[PDB]
């Protein structure tokens, strides 16, 4: 078999994930699809995962059948994971108290250099100590966490296994009477959507005892620091929540507004694509393209709103650690106390770390804690059943397309005034403090380093604000403007495009490109850039103290680019295969859930119970390797994370003869914050390259083939078809510009007001011929008409002097003026005496509005008759000589019959028929053989 490196592993070896290297190398150059990879535990099959869970489910429902109450499911899961909730616990409480003593050594190293004495070695020796002692915690936490997160991962995979094999053990025995109730589609939602919420409820679990708790721990802190000032930092602390609710109970809204605004405008575009033979046949594309353009437009206005919404919300939350630390010290020093560099950024520092933790782990608990509870209870309701008896080029064409260049100058200037005014805010306070050491009566004034303070305060919330509002506006722009070319482009492609690519996927990219260029790029954007300028600022101002920090970060920059390309040229892989072994299960169950009969007719049943658990243990194995391939770089990442601040501290604590407490201070408060926003900062460029394949797709369209425009510079004259004879010449008609023929040499001379019919073969090139006259595919020849040709005139100017009867109606979702009549230029009175003569009145006298009727499903109210009968009215109503009537049915037809005989004033009518019993008594006939036509004068002659 296949035997994983995982067990016999000592340890110091699997922390670092040791034995993950040669995977990679295999990786590196061979592209392994399947064959290389390692299989799983022998204590994570699903028959062992499923059974003990089986087994302590009866054992419960067993218990609980003696009292009158109902037997839980959760109390089956918490009898068999105790141990390990007890086992993760103590971990999760020594690291959770691991982030307390870091402020706490801190404080005392920077007292340590508050009371300096050259003429001493033994305090030194004590700041050593402390330094070491400051130097595990980082370690704790940076090194052993990524296998306790790994532990806490895997505990969840099992719990999802052992609930899939025993939902499957359970449906496979299920009467005709409870089968009749569930469906197919249900019990694979059940299987897809409830259990796979198993995955992400152990990692938030521990926040809700640990959560408050550090939250008591560090208010405690700062009352032997500061005082009660401390609480004038807790008050703002808690109208985040209330900030942040009303801004998603407000935000819903709109996006459900903008959604039922898109929809019909994705139902109108399907519509559209449908179908456009007949629209570039009768020449009706304005009427679409502006009933597409409102919608977009109304689209547009109401995303806007949404995103400077989402816009202030970042802004909000980009600058709220400033606010909170301005008011707890304008309120410590505003009572009578002197400022120090050793209560300052102790104050900072566990202000920072409670904060950030608080609102971003607590309320995402609550509903993972929810959702598994509401999942927990419908999983349990189920088993209560009854039994049997990209480029450079992709962004400058996305960018350029937004505004000018100086738009694009004036954002660079702005981005680089926030981040300057949120550092010098600091810088402040340590020059208050160096300037108040300096002392040896004689205070001072306090209007000058208030006022500052409150300018350096207001600065960095104005340049927050106005940043990501200009930033969100110019990439809605780029969309909002990259729509319409889109639409232009794709209505004027010739039918030879469009009969080479289903309706289908045409659709889907309207829809999800647009979706996502208007969705998640922007916000997506902004997070990295203000990640990335942190991140930036916070090395500069740690390099700008000690001038030879900017040696070492050579070495650590180089080996960064060199290891995410390592790492990516083989991480992309296991998502393919986690999807090609999700999807072999659910056909397996899919196609095994319908055929249970032949099931129970033979006395063989654990077998499809063994096909299912090895159809598992596929997925599970392909599963196993994401969580390690994960977890192999952040343990790399937090060395050098960590490394940076042991040298930094380090250095700081030998050079301490050439500077001072409060520069110092600055420099180390700012390196105990690297971890977050570093992990963020690499983590998100990932999810931009994987959504700039919508940006790349997009970009796509827009150039493509492009037919005759629509007009010329010659104008025919005012009235050009009258006496409309028709000749032909030596002409060969093809569909492909160099593919095979379908034509050969059709020549012949139609006269006016003659009836010329066309009898031939079905397939052998019959309907070629209205699409030779109508130029939707340019011939070779020339094709006189009236005096003149047809390649020198204009698209527009040719299609709308003549009239087709299509062989099967086609009617748009709309009104009844519209479908007859979408250009305004007929009266009322006219279309009533046209409709009321081609013996359709009474069909629409007894709907209530009788002129404005809307129509659903493409005028599901109306019969196939009616369908004709319409038809025929257009062509009544357009009026033109050259008729083309091409019918081919096999069903009310007599008398539209008869009407096409009497009612037409006799101009130039030519059939394309295959009914021989209605080419009766025609002036002129052709008949067509594989390759040619021949025309005879009389049809007597033939008869």
Same mark, same amino acid.
């Given at each position: 078999?296949?035997?994983?490196?995982?067990?016999?592993?000592?340890?110091?070896?699997?922390?670092?994930?040791?034995?993950?290297?040669?995977?990679?190398?295999?990786?590196?150059?061979?592209?392994?699809?399947?064959?290389?990879?390692?299989?799983?535990?022998?204590?994570?099959?699903?028959?062992?995962?499923?059974?003990?869970?089986?087994?302590?489910?009866?054992?419960?429902?067993?218990?609980?059948?003696?009292?009158?109450?109902?037997?839980?499911?959760?109390?089956?899961?918490?009898?068999?994971?105790?141990?390990?909730?007890?086992?993760?616990?103590?971990?999760?409480?020594?690291?959770?108290?691991?982030?307390?003593?870091?402020?706490?050594?801190?404080?005392?190293?920077?007292?340590?250099?508050?009371?300096?004495?050259?003429?001493?070695?033994?305090?030194?020796?004590?700041?050593?100590?402390?330094?070491?002692?400051?130097?595990?915690?980082?370690?704790?936490?940076?090194?052993?966490?990524?296998?306790?997160?790994?532990?806490?991962?895997?505990?969840?995979?099992?719990?999802?296994?052992?609930?899939?094999?025993?939902?499957?053990?359970?449906?496979?025995?299920?009467?005709?009477?409870?089968?009749?109730?569930?469906?197919?589609?249900?019990?694979?939602?059940?299987?897809?959507?409830?259990?796979?919420?198993?995955?992400?409820?152990?990692?938030?679990?521990?926040?809700?005892?640990?959560?408050?708790?550090?939250?008591?721990?560090?208010?405690?802190?700062?009352?032997?620091?500061?005082?009660?000032?401390?609480?004038?930092?807790?008050?703002?602390?808690?109208?985040?929540?209330?900030?942040?609710?009303?801004?998603?109970?407000?935000?819903?809204?709109? %996006?459900?507004?903008?959604?039922? *605004?898109?929809?019909?405008? /994705?139902?109108?575009?399907? &519509?559209? !694509?449908?179908? #456009? @033979?007949?629209?570039?046949?009768?020449?009706?594309?304005?009427?679409?393209?502006?009933?597409?353009?409102?919608?977009?437009?109304?689209?547009?206005?109401?995303?806007?709103?949404?995103?400077?919404?989402?816009?202030?919300?970042?802004?909000?939350?980009?600058?709220?650690?400033?606010?909170?630390?301005?008011?707890?010290?304008?309120?410590?020093?505003?009572?009578?106390?002197?400022?120090?560099?050793?209560?300052?950024?102790?104050?900072?520092?566990?202000?920072?770390?409670? %904060?950030?933790?608080?609102?971003? *782990?607590?309320?995402?608990? /609550?509903?993972?804690?929810? &959702?598994? !509870?509401?999942? #927990? @209870?419908?999983?349990?309701?189920?088993?209560?059943?009854?039994?049997?008896?990209?480029?450079?080029?992709?962004?400058?064409?996305?960018?350029?397309?937004?505004?000018?260049?100086?738009?694009?100058?004036?954002?660079?200037?702005?981005?680089?005034?926030?981040?300057?005014?949120?550092?010098?805010?600091?810088?402040?306070?340590?020059?208050?403090?160096?300037?108040?050491?300096?002392?040896?009566?004689?205070?001072?004034?306090?209007?000058?380093?208030?006022?500052?303070?409150?300018?350096?305060?207001?600065?960095?919330?104005?340049?927050?604000?106005?940043?990501?509002?200009?930033?969100?506006?110019?990439?809605?722009?780029?969309?909002?403007?990259?729509?319409?070319?889109?639409?232009?482009?794709?209505?004027?492609?010739?039918?030879?495009?469009?009969?080479?690519?289903?309706?289908?996927?045409?659709?889907?990219?309207?829809?999800?490109?647009?979706?996502?260029?208007?969705?998640?790029?922007?916000?997506?954007?902004?997070?990295?850039?203000?990640?990335?300028?942190?991140?930036?600022?916070?090395?500069?101002?740690?390099?700008?103290?000690?001038?030879?920090?900017?040696?070492?970060?050579?070495?650590?920059?180089?080996?960064?680019?060199?290891?995410?390309?390592?790492?990516?040229?083989?991480?992309?892989?296991?998502?393919?295969?986690?999807?090609?072994?999700?999807?072999?299960?659910?056909?397996?169950?899919?196609?095994?859930?319908?055929?249970?009969?032949?099931?129970?007719?033979?006395?063989?049943?654990?077998?499809?119970?063994?096909?299912?658990?090895?159809?598992?243990?596929?997925?599970?194995?392909?599963?196993?390797?994401?969580?390690?391939?994960?977890?192999?770089?952040?343990?790399?990442?937090?060395?050098?994370?960590?490394?940076?601040?042991?040298?930094?501290?380090?250095?700081?604590?030998?050079?301490?003869?050439?500077?001072?407490?409060?520069?110092?201070?600055?420099?180390?408060?700012?390196?105990?914050?690297?971890?977050?926003?570093?992990?963020?900062?690499?983590?998100?460029?990932?999810?931009?390259?994987?959504?700039?394949?919508?940006?790349?797709?997009?970009?796509?369209?827009?150039?493509?083939?492009?037919?005759?425009?629509?007009?010329?510079?010659?104008?025919?004259?005012?009235?050009?078809?009258?006496?409309?004879?028709?000749?032909?010449?030596?002409?060969?008609?093809?569909?492909?510009?160099?593919?095979?023929?379908?034509?050969?040499?059709?020549?012949?001379?139609?006269?006016?007001?003659?009836?010329?019919?066309?009898?031939?073969?079905?397939?052998?090139?019959?309907?070629?011929?209205?699409?030779?006259?109508?130029?939707?595919?340019?011939?070779?020849?020339?094709?006189?008409?009236?005096?003149?040709?047809?390649?020198?005139?204009?698209?527009?100017?040719?299609?709308?002097?003549?009239?087709?009867?299509?062989?099967?109606?086609?009617?748009?979702?709309?009104?009844?003026?519209?479908?007859?009549?979408?250009?305004?230029?007929?009266?009322?009175?006219?279309?009533?005496?046209?409709?009321?003569?081609?013996?359709?009145?009474?069909?629409?006298?007894?709907?209530?509005?009788?002129?404005?009727?809307?129509?659903?499903?493409?005028?599901?109210?109306?019969?196939?008759?009616?369908?004709?009968?319409?038809?025929?009215?257009?062509?009544?109503?357009?009026?033109?000589?050259?008729?083309?009537?091409?019918?081919?049915?096999?069903?009310?037809?007599?008398?539209?019959?008869?009407?096409?005989?009497?009612?037409?004033?006799?101009?130039?009518?030519?059939?394309?028929?295959?009914?021989?019993?209605?080419?009766?008594?025609?002036?002129?006939?052709?008949?067509?053989?594989?390759?040619?036509?021949?025309?005879?004068?009389?049809?007597?002659?033939?008869?």
């Amino acid at each position: 078999v296949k035997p994983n490196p995982l067990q016999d592993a000592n340890l110091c070896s699997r922390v670092f994930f040791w034995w993950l290297n040669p995977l990679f190398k295999i990786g590196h150059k061979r592209r392994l699809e399947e064959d290389d990879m390692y299989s799983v535990l022998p204590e994570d099959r699903s028959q062992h995962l499923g059974e003990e869970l089986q087994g302590f489910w009866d054992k419960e429902v067993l218990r609980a059948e003696n009292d009158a109450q109902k037997p839980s499911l959760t109390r089956a899961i918490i009898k068999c994971y105790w141990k390990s909730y007890l086992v993760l616990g103590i971990f999760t409480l020594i690291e959770e108290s691991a982030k307390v003593i870091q402020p706490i050594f801190l404080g005392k190293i920077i007292n340590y250099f508050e009371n300096y004495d050259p003429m001493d070695s033994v305090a030194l020796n004590t700041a050593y100590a402390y330094a070491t002692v400051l130097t595990f915690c980082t370690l704790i936490l940076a090194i052993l966490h990524h296998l306790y997160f790994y532990h806490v991962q895997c505990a969840g995979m099992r719990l999802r296994v052992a609930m899939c094999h025993m939902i499957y053990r359970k449906a496979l025995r299920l009467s005709n009477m409870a089968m009749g109730k569930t469906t197919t589609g249900q019990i694979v939602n059940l299987l897809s959507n409830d259990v796979n919420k198993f995955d992400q409820v152990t990692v938030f679990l521990h926040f809700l005892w640990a959560g408050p708790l550090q939250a008591i721990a560090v208010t405690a802190l700062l009352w032997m620091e500061i005082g009660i000032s401390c609480l004038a930092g807790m008050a703002v602390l808690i109208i985040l929540l209330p900030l942040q609710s009303c801004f998603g109970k407000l935000f819903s809204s709109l %996006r459900s507004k903008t959604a039922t *605004f898109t929809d019909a405008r /994705i139902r109108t575009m399907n &519509e559209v !694509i449908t179908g #456009i @033979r007949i629209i570039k046949m009768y020449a009706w594309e304005k009427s679409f393209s502006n009933l597409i353009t409102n919608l977009r437009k109304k689209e547009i206005s109401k995303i806007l709103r949404s995103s400077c919404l989402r816009g202030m919300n970042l802004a909000s939350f980009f600058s709220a650690s400033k606010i909170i630390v301005f008011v707890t010290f304008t309120t410590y020093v505003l009572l009578g106390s002197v400022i120090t560099a050793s209560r300052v950024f102790v104050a900072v520092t566990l202000y920072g770390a409670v %904060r950030l933790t608080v609102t971003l *782990f607590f309320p995402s608990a /609550i509903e993972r804690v929810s &959702e598994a !509870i509401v999942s #927990i @209870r419908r999983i349990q309701t189920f088993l209560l059943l009854d039994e049997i008896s990209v480029g450079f080029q992709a962004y400058k064409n996305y960018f350029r397309a937004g505004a000018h260049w100086i738009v694009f100058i004036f954002l660079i200037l702005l981005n680089t005034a926030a981040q300057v005014a949120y550092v010098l805010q600091d810088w402040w306070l340590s020059y208050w403090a160096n300037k108040q050491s300096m002392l040896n009566t004689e205070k001072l004034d306090l209007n000058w380093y208030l006022g500052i303070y409150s300018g350096l305060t207001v600065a960095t919330v104005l340049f927050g604000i106005a940043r990501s509002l200009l930033v969100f506006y110019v990439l809605v722009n780029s969309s909002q403007t990259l729509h319409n070319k889109m639409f232009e482009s794709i209505l004027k492609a010739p039918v030879l495009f469009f009969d080479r690519n289903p309706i289908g996927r045409i659709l889907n990219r309207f829809s999800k490109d647009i979706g996502h260029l208007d969705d998640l790029l922007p916000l997506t954007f902004l997070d990295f850039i203000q990640t990335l300028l942190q991140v930036v600022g916070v090395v500069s101002v740690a390099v700008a103290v000690i001038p030879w920090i900017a040696i070492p970060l050579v070495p650590l920059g180089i080996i960064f680019i060199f290891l995410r390309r390592y790492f990516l040229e083989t991480s992309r892989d296991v998502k393919r295969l986690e999807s090609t072994t999700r999807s072999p299960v659910f056909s397996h169950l899919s196609s095994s859930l319908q055929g249970l009969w032949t099931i129970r007719a033979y006395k063989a049943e654990e077998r499809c119970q063994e096909l299912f658990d090895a159809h598992q243990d596929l997925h599970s194995e392909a599963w196993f390797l994401f969580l390690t391939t994960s977890r192999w770089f952040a343990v790399r990442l937090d060395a050098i994370c960590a490394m940076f601040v042991i040298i930094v501290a380090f250095g700081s604590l030998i050079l301490a003869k050439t500077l001072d407490a409060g520069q110092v201070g600055l420099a180390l408060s700012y390196a105990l914050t690297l971890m977050g926003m570093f992990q963020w900062c690499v983590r998100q460029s990932a999810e931009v390259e994987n959504m700039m394949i919508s940006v790349e797709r997009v970009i796509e369209y827009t150039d493509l083939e492009k037919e005759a425009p629509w007009e010329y510079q010659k104008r025919p004259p005012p009235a050009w078809p009258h006496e409309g004879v028709i000749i032909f010449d030596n002409v060969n008609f093809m569909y492909s510009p160099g593919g095979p023929l379908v034509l050969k040499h059709l020549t012949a001379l139609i006269k006016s007001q003659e009836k010329v019919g066309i009898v031939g073969r079905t397939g052998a090139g019959k309907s070629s011929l209205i699409s030779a006259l109508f130029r939707l595919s340019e011939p070779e020849g020339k094709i006189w008409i009236d005096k003149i040709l047809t390649t020198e005139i204009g698209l527009h100017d040719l299609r709308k002097k003549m009239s087709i009867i299509p062989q099967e109606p086609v009617l748009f979702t709309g009104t009844m003026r519209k479908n007859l009549d979408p250009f305004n230029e007929h009266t009322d009175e006219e279309l009533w005496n046209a409709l009321q003569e081609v013996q359709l009145k009474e069909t629409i006298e007894d709907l209530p509005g009788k002129m404005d009727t809307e129509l659903a499903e493409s005028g599901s109210n109306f019969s196939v008759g009616q369908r004709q009968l319409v038809c025929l009215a257009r062509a009544i109503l357009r009026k033109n000589q050259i008729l083309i009537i091409d019918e081919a049915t096999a069903n009310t037809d007599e008398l539209i019959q008869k009407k096409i005989r009497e009612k037409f004033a006799h101009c130039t009518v030519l059939t394309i028929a295959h009914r021989l019993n209605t080419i009766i008594d025609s002036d002129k006939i052709m008949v067509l053989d594989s390759g040619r036509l021949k025309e005879y004068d009389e049809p007597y002659v033939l008869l």
